[PDB]
Amino acid sequence: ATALTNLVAEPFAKLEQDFGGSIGVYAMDTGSGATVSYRAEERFPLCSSFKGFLAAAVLARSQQQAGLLDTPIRYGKNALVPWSPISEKYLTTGMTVAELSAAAVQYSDNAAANLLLKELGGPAGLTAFMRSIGDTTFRLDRWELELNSAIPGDARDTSSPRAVTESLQKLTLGSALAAPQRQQFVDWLKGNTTGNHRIRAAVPADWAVGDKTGTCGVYGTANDYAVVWPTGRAPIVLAVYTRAPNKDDKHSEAVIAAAARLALEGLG
Template sequence: MRARLAVLPAFAVLLGGCSGAPTAPSPTTPVTSRAPSPASSPAVVPDPGFSALEQEFGARLGVYAVDTGSGRTVAHRADERFAYASTYKALAAAAVLDSGADLATPVRITDLVDYSPLTERHVGGTMTLGEVAEAAVTVSDNTAGNLLFDQLGGPEGFEARLRALGDTVTESARTEPGLNRWNPGEVDDTSSPRAFAADLRAYAVGDALDADDRDVFTGWLRGGTTGAEQIRAGVPAGWVVGDKTGHAGRYGNQDDVGVVWPSGGRAPWVVVVFSDRPGLDDESDPALVARATGLVVDALS
């Protein structure tokens, strides 16, 4: 593991709103450029109750959410570092799409790690690269996550892809399962809510991916099966959510990142919620993420 000081670099790519009148795009309509441009005076919503949630749950909560139509944002500890756990799999899958790799390429399944519910069915055989990426995003298959790292040139290659988006914050150092062994104050395998949201926005809503690849990526996000109690539970019925959860299994870490398409054809929101607690063996609670999302909904609505 690389030793680093826990110093957060300034992240130059901000998540301001787009200029001009807000539109109501479909889930595949880009509303940002590859590197989202800051608005001259984005509307930042004051803390709608995140501090009270932290006290209630005995947790540290990091939130960044942006309405990509209006540019309104909600932020709490948005520039602090949190372990990203399995949420990286969403960005890694998008980075593979961005690389131009052929999703039909066969990938041999050999070295399994813990929690690999889909890849374990194919040991000794192959899956397509597209099936591997889908498994990583939709069921959080850990072997699939490592295979995405392999496709990108390891954690360093994944990190380089994020740097190309303008992300100078996210640090990727280890593969599964080691990336989950985060301790407070460490920098490896962490990001900030603001930085992660910028990456997710570029891939899922902006034009970092071409239209066809963006459709594939957002389809994987919407097909997620692990987040029913988190962001999905915090939005009104009828809203569409595509998300990727993360859970390191230590320090009460519980994360969820996603794109929310409100009803009525409104522009999508990008929502990132990270959380942890002070004790190594503290339990995580998906309800904290759901409640935080509910506060985001109230604030942005």
């Protein structure tokens, strides 16, 4: 007999009831192949969460272009947009691709993301990268900060929890990247600073987590995806995305953490 997915799903529906919006979740146990899935194929805005995949695309490019990560990007004052706390410190010198990648992932730096997008051929180049690993759902169409509009019914700048989880697994645990690049992606995710109240809040403190968050600031739209390494166990990959119908519907980090907890608890 197969899983009773109605029973797996029920607590997400109650959670999203109180939240006033939609919650989408996919979780993969790479030990058993067990999954938990709730609106897992619906589209949600990526917001800043595309930046993890951007860092992976940079790493892929570095496989073809020796020393790419070492390359300085010396930018002007018009690179600087709000929520760029690292790239704003280094206007007088520039930053390396590696530093920009770390800042995009770990501080969600907007200008760093835009600079790296430019290096990879814009939103379309990142999307092409995702298509190269078999992700047909992911799309990045716009730049920072327009990509955060999160307009209900707009497919631009969205993915699904399932596609995000599958692509994250391929890139962090699978061999989609060479081993050095894969470990670098994992290390960047593990050093994220913005995720303490989201998936990480649902995970025992002695288990390593890498994650990337997103918060569009409108339409109750926010998210997190992660790899979790339980001690002496196969890792778990999961994604939690939210959205809501009114522009002034609040996002909730507590709802993300609660959903993560329901997904992690429900595996296998």
